[PDB]
Design a binder for this molecule. Structure first.
Ligand SMILES: [Mg+2]
Ligand SMILES: [Mg+2]
Ligand SMILES: [Mg+2]
Ligand SMILES: [Mg+2]
Ligand SMILES: [Mg+2]
Ligand SMILES: [Mg+2]
Ligand SMILES: [Mg+2]
Ligand SMILES: [Mg+2]
Ligand SMILES: [Mg+2]
Ligand SMILES: [Mg+2]
Ligand SMILES: [Mg+2]
Ligand SMILES: [Mg+2]
Ligand SMILES: [Mg+2]
Ligand SMILES: [Mg+2]
Ligand SMILES: [Mg+2]
Ligand SMILES: [Mg+2]
Ligand SMILES: [Mg+2]
Ligand SMILES: [Mg+2]
Ligand SMILES: [Mg+2]
Ligand SMILES: [Mg+2]
Ligand SMILES: [Mg+2]
Ligand SMILES: [Mg+2]
Ligand SMILES: [Mg+2]
Ligand SMILES: [Mg+2]
Ligand SMILES: [Mg+2]
Ligand SMILES: [Mg+2]
Ligand SMILES: [Mg+2]
Ligand SMILES: [Mg+2]
Ligand SMILES: [Mg+2]
Ligand SMILES: [Mg+2]
Ligand SMILES: [Mg+2]
Ligand SMILES: [Mg+2]
Ligand SMILES: [Mg+2]
Ligand SMILES: [Mg+2]
Ligand SMILES: [Mg+2]
Ligand SMILES: [Mg+2]
Ligand SMILES: [Mg+2]
Ligand SMILES: [Mg+2]
Ligand SMILES: [Mg+2]
Ligand SMILES: [Mg+2]
Ligand SMILES: [Mg+2]
Ligand SMILES: [Mg+2]
Ligand SMILES: [Mg+2]
Ligand SMILES: [Mg+2]
Ligand SMILES: [Mg+2]
Lengths: 60, 253, 75, 113, 133
RNA sequence: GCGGUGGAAACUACCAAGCUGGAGUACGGUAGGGGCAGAGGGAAUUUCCGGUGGAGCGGUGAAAUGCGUAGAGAUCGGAAAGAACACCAACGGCGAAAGCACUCUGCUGGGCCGACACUGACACUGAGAGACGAAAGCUAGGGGAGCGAAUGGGAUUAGAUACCCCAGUAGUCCUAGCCGUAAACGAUGGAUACUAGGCGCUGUGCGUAUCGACCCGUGCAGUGUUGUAGCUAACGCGUUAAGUAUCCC
């Protein structure tokens, strides 16, 4: 079903913001139904993006 | 590290001689006297000669301060001494001016120093010569700067304002392990011309405020006292209204 | 290229990786994880040298004279 | 195509203050491109996406002593191939400038999922 | 694989206890001989050889289950005697006999491997490899 | 039992040559909180400097000490500092063990898999010996927000040198050492060989599916849960044995 065919990075924000919660929290692998490898890369990405202010730690 | 050269014109014999005797010839500053003859090295504290490129030829011992001192040359051939910065090695190059790289041994006004730097040899007065942080391992951070005034944290911990146009030098002062020495014997003090001190409690009542009680004196004095009759502990002697007060912010802790 | 499985080549590869690791052991001494490995590899090289001494004396002495490997602890 | 001969692949994101002109921007561009190349970088490829509002507010102190509170920002993106030895001074030199408020650099690994 | 003999013996014991007729064992002069003997005694149904990648496997058919798998009155026991740590030798008059002779004893002697029966006829002693019930 | 002599040559031992499946080397891949070192980041908290405001805050089973009209707490704006890294996180990953997780980069240790590319038994264990080794502790120098042995006050209680509360010093942190112990636990030494399955996961490889993500079947390597044989005093263990055998400590 859902899959990643395009390279995931910290700069594809559509990609990452699919996997982020309303409050900015990162969703678990069980919910997102991704391979372990995937979820790890997602997570590192979300964090690196978080440092560059592409995505917020907390909300406004 | 330490190798004796011949004498450069910077080393003279002229000096005050009686240590701690003033004009009247009285001993004022106690406990001095004795100890090895010394020669005066003429340090360059101002570093006022701008925009020429200096080179550290050697590193030498100085009897007068516990830091080290460096003989530096120029292309012009003038030779100066400077205080030895910490981590500087023979062959190194230093320079003073306004627009200058920031590295060890370079000297610049406080307008041009990036905040957070570690400084030594700090003029409080334009062209008066460097004064603050001249001892071994002494260093001062430049914390903030605003208006015409720059803020430092002195090695005593005291935070204080000075003028933004006063020169200073990057890098901490060398020979850091000097207080790690342990003299080990009385003679070793006497070599420094520091004579033995007599405890108050010991002397007779005429000689000092804790004077001979019968056996051994507790100090009955309701307070520990100077030879001259003032409270010895925790009585602040800074002149109340002294001109410096506007500049001084937090006091050493 | 020659024999990449031969006794002498293997002992060479080990000796060289060891002298390469000595530099990293020096710059960072607080890495034990690395040193544990160094001890392992040095153990292997020692093993092959002992084996090689059992098998052929000439090739052995030639080798430890050649690669500047210290003389053996059986003496 | 990209083919490094004894160098590593790199991506660097840098963020600059929104108050900048295009001339100061291309001055920094030029400066850092020259740093990279002076550090043995074949293929210095630069790209730019400017003025996007940040996720959160960032503060930067200048050498003038200013506290600059921002909202917007300028994203520069650098694909370059350099010796693993020389990436060291670059990041400090990026942090040093008053125009670069937030800098980060990533090594790029080939994707296999 | 410090001991090959004990290993063969063991694989047999394991396949036997699990009620399987078929065993793969690695061949060797000792192995082969031992199995031959095992056949001429009647402890094992049939043996044959296989080869792949320069490896030899003797497969051994084993005597069928006793009137079901569940109700077994009899198993088939094997015991290593002389092993690398202690080598047991015996002269002609100390040669062991198992359960009054119902089982057998394997000997490695000057004239090759054999049973204790052959040793008694020919008058030779030697190294005792194993006991077989 | 010991000694001499004549024979036998399977096994150990020796001598000469061989052989890859054991152990390695090269090659090419790939996962990783492995280690050391250097950069950067944000919440939260505490204190300090202001503006508002103006009687209680805080705390307990119920209270009181404590903080507060010298303006507390609350709230907005500013600085400064240290320590720890929410979500991800999972009956998940790596490590020899101890342990290891905000992010990044650099130096480097292993592991596994696929190919014959190569050496050709180089193996397994290990008395003494060496290295690492949580926390507390100690020596020397820094650092000190929170927490908090000790200590002090308030209670509770016959008593309370305790549990509870209010304060709070060592220490917790960093550098360089020393100490060498733990329920350092899987309460299970290491290597090898061999013995039903079922359901799972991680890393990879092959075939299939499409020609790229699944998908399926499988080969290994590790990791988890039920359970047959067998074992066990019982509990239970059960291909990661506490089963059947060999070797060393
Ligand atoms: Mg002279
Ligand atoms: Mg002269
Ligand atoms: Mg006079
Ligand atoms: Mg004294
Ligand atoms: Mg005295
Ligand atoms: Mg007297
Ligand atoms: Mg007098
Ligand atoms: Mg008097
Ligand atoms: Mg008195
Ligand atoms: Mg008396
Ligand atoms: Mg006998
Ligand atoms: Mg005899
Ligand atoms: Mg023979
Ligand atoms: Mg041989
Ligand atoms: Mg570190
Ligand atoms: Mg902040
Ligand atoms: Mg008011
Ligand atoms: Mg009160
Ligand atoms: Mg007050
Ligand atoms: Mg008011
Ligand atoms: Mg308040
Ligand atoms: Mg900070
Ligand atoms: Mg593991
Ligand atoms: Mg932790
Ligand atoms: Mg690695
Ligand atoms: Mg050969
Ligand atoms: Mg031991
Ligand atoms: Mg130790
Ligand atoms: Mg500790
Ligand atoms: Mg103590
Ligand atoms: Mg201390
Ligand atoms: Mg405190
Ligand atoms: Mg507390
Ligand atoms: Mg009390
Ligand atoms: Mg007190
Ligand atoms: Mg009481
Ligand atoms: Mg407190
Ligand atoms: Mg330590
Ligand atoms: Mg113990
Ligand atoms: Mg533990
Ligand atoms: Mg599936
Ligand atoms: Mg397995
Ligand atoms: Mg279990
Ligand atoms: Mg079980
Ligand atoms: Mg048991």
């Amino acid at each position: 079903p859902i899959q990643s065919g395009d390279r995931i990075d910290y700069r594809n924000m559509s990609l990452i913001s699919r996997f982020i919660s309303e409050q900015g929290k990162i969703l678990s692998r069980r919910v997102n139904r991704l391979t372990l490898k995937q979820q790890r890369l997602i997570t590192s990405a979300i964090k690196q993006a978080r440092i560059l202010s592409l995505l917020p730690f907390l909300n406004n | 590290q330490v190798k004796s050269n011949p004498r450069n014109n910077l080393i003279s014999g002229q000096r005050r001689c009686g240590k701690g005797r003033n004009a009247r010839g009285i001993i004022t500053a106690r406990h001095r006297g004795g100890g090895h003859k010394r020669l005066y090295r003429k340090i360059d504290f101002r570093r006022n000669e701008k925009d020429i490129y200096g080179k550290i030829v050697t590193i030498e011992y100085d009897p007068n301060r516990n830091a080290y001192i460096c003989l530096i040359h120029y292309g012009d051939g003038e030779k100066r001494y400077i205080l030895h910065p910490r981590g500087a090695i023979i062959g190194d190059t230093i320079v003073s001016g306004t627009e200058v790289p920031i590295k060890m041994g370079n000297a610049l006004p406080l307008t041009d120093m990036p905040l957070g730097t570690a400084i030594h040899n700090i003029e409080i007065t334009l062209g008066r010569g460097g004064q603050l942080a001249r001892a071994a391992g002494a260093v001062a951070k430049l914390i903030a700067k605003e208006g015409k005034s720059a803020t430092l944290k002195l090695p005593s911990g005291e935070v204080r304002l000075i003028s933004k146009n006063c020169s200073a030098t990057v890098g901490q002062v060398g020979n850091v392990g000097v207080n790690q020495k342990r003299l080990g014997r009385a003679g070793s003090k006497r070599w420094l011309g520091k004579r033995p001190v007599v405890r108050g409690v010991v002397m007779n009542p005429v000689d000092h405020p804790h004077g001979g009680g019968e056996g051994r004196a507790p100090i009955g004095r309701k307070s520990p006292t100077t030879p001259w009759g003032y409270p010895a502990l925790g009585r602040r002697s800074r002149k109340r209204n002294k001109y410096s007060d506007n500049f001084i912010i937090r006091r050493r802790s | 290229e020659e024999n990449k499985g031969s006794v002498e080549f293997q002992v060479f590869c080990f000796t060289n990786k060891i002298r390469r690791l000595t530099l990293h052991l020096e710059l960072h001494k607080k890495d034990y994880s690395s040193q544990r490995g160094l001890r392992k590899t040095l153990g292997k090289r020692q093993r092959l040298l002992a084996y090689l001494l059992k098998i052929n004396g000439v090739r052995y002495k030639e080798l430890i004279s050649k690669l500047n490997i210290r003389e053996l602890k059986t003496r | 195509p990209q083919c490094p001969p004894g160098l590593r692949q790199y991506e660097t994101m840098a963020v600059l203050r929104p108050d900048m002109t295009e001339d100061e921007r291309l001055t920094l561009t030029q400066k850092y491109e020259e740093l990279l190349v002076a550090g043995g970088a074949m293929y210095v490829e630069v790209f730019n996406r400017g003025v996007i509002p940040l996720a959160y507010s960032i503060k930067r102190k200048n050498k003038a002593g200013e506290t600059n509170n921002y909202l917007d920002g300028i994203y520069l993106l650098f694909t370059y191939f350099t010796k693993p030895e020389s990436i060291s001074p670059l990041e400090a030199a990026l942090v040093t400038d008053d125009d670069v408020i937030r800098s980060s650099s990533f090594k790029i690994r080939k994707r296999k999922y | 694989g410090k001991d090959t003999i004990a290993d063969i013996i063991t694989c047999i014991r394991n396949a036997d206890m699990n009620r399987k007729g078929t065993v793969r064992i690695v061949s060797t002069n000792i192995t082969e001989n031992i199995v031959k003997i095992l056949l001429r005694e009647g402890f094992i149904e049939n043996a044959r050889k296989h080869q792949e990648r320069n490896k030899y496997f003797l497969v051994l058919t084993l005597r069928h289950r006793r009137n079901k798998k569940g109700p077994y009155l009899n198993t088939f026991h094997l015991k290593r005697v002389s092993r690398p740590g202690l080598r047991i030798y015996s002269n002609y008059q100390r040669i062991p006999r198992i359960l009054g002779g119902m089982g057998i004893a394997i000997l490695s002697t000057s004239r090759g491997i054999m049973t204790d029966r052959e040793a008694r006829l020919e008058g030779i002693g030697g190294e005792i490899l194993c006991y077989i019930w």
